[PDB]
């Protein structure tokens, strides 16, 4: 096809305010401040050849340690998970290689197309270490990306900002704005 | 001013390439005295931070910022490899 760039979004993307530049302290998170937002994903060109299927890596929800009972809302544990890259899987688009379904209950952190999928990244290291090297005997990779916008995430503080990192505000700056940037 | 390290690219990668330390510009040509070796690294071309939020309740079918706890995590992955040459010193 002719060269060109696509574009993906979400009608209810979890984007509080524009944190790239603000003239006054942002209002206050009410209920559902999600916005209809789109973006042009990171560019990726790659080709893997081998006599065994390709292997990828992505962060998923690791198994918890049998101790402290996971309080609801507690941050889930991470675990790098090796998987077989299947036809139709999604490529990291700028939000890294992770399982958004099992790591984002929100269902609104990223555009629809990766929103309930897993973005996997070729595990080049593992494949090349492979003793016989059947999984891949040749490859070409080309990826590039830059920050277009800087946003805030609505929701509630999962982990508070240690107060030794700042001086308490007052009035409007009395309440700390979400420092969960993306 | 507010900084900005522009776009990141494969073509500009420094890592995942072998470095052949044959001729050093210093007098110590790669000798690891003390059987020690220091490898310092800084790579901001993989600084993606991922936000993961858990729901406090899996009931209501209506979004409530109060129902979800937002967090941030970042992962780094390394793999160091070396080729060493045995050397002798007549004392």
């Amino acid at each position: 096809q002719p060269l060109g760039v696509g574009i993906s979004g979400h009608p209810l993307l979890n984007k509080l305010d524009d944190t790239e530049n603000a003239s006054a302290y942002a209002a206050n998170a009410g209920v559902d401040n999600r916005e209809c937002i789109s973006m042009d994903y990171k560019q990726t060109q790659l080709c893997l050849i081998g006599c065994k299927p390709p292997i990828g890596e992505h962060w998923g929800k690791g198994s918890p340690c049998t101790q402290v009972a996971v309080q609801p809302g507690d941050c889930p544990p991470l675990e790098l998970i090796n998987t077989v890259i299947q036809d139709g899987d999604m490529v990291d688009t700028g939000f890294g290689a992770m399982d958004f379904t099992t790591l984002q209950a929100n269902k609104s952190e990223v555009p629809l197309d990766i929103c309930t999928s897993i973005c996997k990244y070729p595990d080049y290291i593992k494949m090349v270490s492979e003793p016989y090297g059947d999984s891949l005997f040749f490859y070409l990779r080309r990826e590039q990306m830059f920050v277009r916008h800087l946003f805030n995430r609505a929701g509630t503080v999962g982990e508070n900002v240690p107060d030794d990192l700042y001086i308490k505000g007052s009035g409007s700056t009395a309440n700390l704005a979400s420092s969960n940037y993306f | 001013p507010t900084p900005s390290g522009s776009m990141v690219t494969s073509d500009a990668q420094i890592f995942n390439k072998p470095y052949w330390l044959q001729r050093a510009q210093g007098h110590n040509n790669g000798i690891c005295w003390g059987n020690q070796l220091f490898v310092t690294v800084v790579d901001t071309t993989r600084s993606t931070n991922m936000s993961l939020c858990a729901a406090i309740s899996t009931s209501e079918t209506t979004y409530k910022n109060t129902n979800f706890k937002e967090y941030l995590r970042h992962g780094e992955e390394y793999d160091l490899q070396f080729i060493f040459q045995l050397c002798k010193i007549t004392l």
Partner: antibody, heavy 119, light 108 residues
Framework: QLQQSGAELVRPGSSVKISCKASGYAFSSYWMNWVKQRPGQGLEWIGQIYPGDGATNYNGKFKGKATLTADKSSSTAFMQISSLTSEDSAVYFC???????????????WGQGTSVTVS | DIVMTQSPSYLSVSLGGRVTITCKASDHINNWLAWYQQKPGNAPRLLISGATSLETGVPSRFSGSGSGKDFTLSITSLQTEDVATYHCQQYWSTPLTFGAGTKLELKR
């Protein structure tokens, strides 16, 4: 709806642990605020607790005297007072922050109050 | 800390008239102030938040206003059920502070 403990009578020097059980909402999203009122007198702020990680802020007056805790599994707040004296005899109240993890816009839901007599 | 004080600690009033209770902060709290009403056997009841906002269930004869450091609660056509002690509270900075209270009594 918040439920507090019944009346207490403790001897000077002793100690008491009082509960405030939460009901009618999702506790795991809210702090708990506690205050003090002596007979025929005004209100004073003790502290507030984030149950999740046990973080809490103290009014200097109640630093060594008060400790706050909470049972997430049963959604209950607790406050313990140490080395009790005649000045600690008062009615204590538990109260919920209006705005989730924020402590502004006042306290919108209060407990019935628990009376403590040191004698 | 921020110190809240109310003008009088007591007022003798008549049913049907307008009653005003003003509170003044030791510092600027910028409309971050609440009013509570308390009767002899129960917890204080929130009437005002954000200096001017009426809470659900609060009769419309109650209202509040002011700014900076000076605020006031106003009750029109005072009802007998309105006879109680009223408190202001600042929440602009911790520790949170309450005024000493103003008790309404009926004159005879």
């Amino acid at each position: 709806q918040l439920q507090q403990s019944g009346a207490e009578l403790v001897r000077p020097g002793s100690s008491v642990k009082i509960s405030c059980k939460a009901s009618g909402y999702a506790f795991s999203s809210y702090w708990m605020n506690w205050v003090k009122q002596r007979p025929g007198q005004g209100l004073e702020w003790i502290g507030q607790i984030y149950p999740g990680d046990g973080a809490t802020n103290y009014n200097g007056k109640f630093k060594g005297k008060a400790t706050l805790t909470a049972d997430k599994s049963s959604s209950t707040a607790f406050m313990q007072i140490s080395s009790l004296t005649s000045e600690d005899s008062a009615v204590y109240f538990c109260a919920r922050p209006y705005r989730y993890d924020g402590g502004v816009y006042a306290m919108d839901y209060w407990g019935q109050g628990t009376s403590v007599t040191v004698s | 800390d921020i110190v809240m004080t109310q003008s009088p600690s007591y007022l003798s009033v008549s049913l049907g008239g307008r009653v005003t209770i003003t509170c003044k902060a030791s510092d600027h709290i910028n409309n971050w102030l609440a009013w509570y009403q308390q009767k002899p056997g129960n917890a204080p009841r929130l009437l005002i938040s954000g200096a001017t906002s009426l809470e659900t269930g609060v009769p419309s004869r109650f209202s509040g206003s002011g700014s900076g450091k000076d605020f006031t609660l106003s009750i029109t056509s005072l009802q007998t059920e309105d006879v109680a002690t009223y408190h202001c509270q600042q929440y602009w900075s911790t520790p949170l502070t309450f005024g000493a209270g103003t008790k309404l009594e009926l004159k005879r």
